[PDB]
Write a protein that binds this ligand. Structure first.
Ligand SMILES: [Ca+2]
Ligand SMILES: [Ca+2]
Ligand SMILES: [Ca+2]
Ligand SMILES: [Ca+2]
Lengths: 139, 25
């Protein structure tokens, strides 16, 4: 893995590590899942940890997490993120596609908010957010 | 400014994509 990919994964890990102690527990996984509006059962949480918990100590450390992310690789996370917004794959995020993502992520929206989000990101003034504008907005 | 909303979507999407990775083993 490149250090840049390891740094992205470290940031991904840190989205789950609520106490910052360098391990992801079932409760930390379930917390994030609940925040996404999922309702995981104890069984599903344990099953997801079990596959990634290489040393069987009951929690996921960063090397175990990194091994899972590396297996996935076999695009950059900001690229995959853009693809989630750009559902029809034309390289541009439209208002409808942004509405779709906000809806899927439980972000309440209004047309004006959506227009202003697009307008703020829209450097070339074409009414949509392309990848380069996307990444600049995320900086 | 709406940069915060954009950043919150990205954070959530990143979390959702890691959850999907756990689910896919
Ligand atoms: Ca932790
Ligand atoms: Ca472990
Ligand atoms: Ca599109
Ligand atoms: Ca544009």
């Amino acid at each position: 893995l490149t250090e840049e990919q390891i740094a992205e994964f470290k940031e991904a890990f840190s989205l789950f590590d609520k106490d910052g102690d360098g391990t992801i527990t079932t409760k930390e996984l379930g917390t994030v899942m609940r925040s996404l509006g999922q309702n995981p059962t104890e069984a599903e949480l344990q099953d997801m940890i079990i596959e990634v918990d290489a040393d069987g100590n009951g929690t996921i450390d960063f090397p175990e997490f990194l091994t899972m992310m590396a297996r996935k690789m076999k695009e950059e996370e900001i690229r995959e993120a853009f693809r989630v917004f750009d559902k029809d794959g034309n390289g541009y995020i439209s208002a409808a596609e942004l509405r779709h993502v906000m809806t899927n992520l439980g972000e309440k929206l209004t047309d004006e908010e959506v227009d202003e989000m697009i307008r703020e990101a829209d450097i070339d003034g074409d009414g949509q957010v392309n990848y380069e504008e996307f990444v600049q907005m995320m900086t | 400014s709406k940069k915060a909303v954009w950043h919150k979507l990205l954070s959530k999407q990143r979390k959702r994509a890691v959850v999907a990775c756990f689910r896919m083993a």
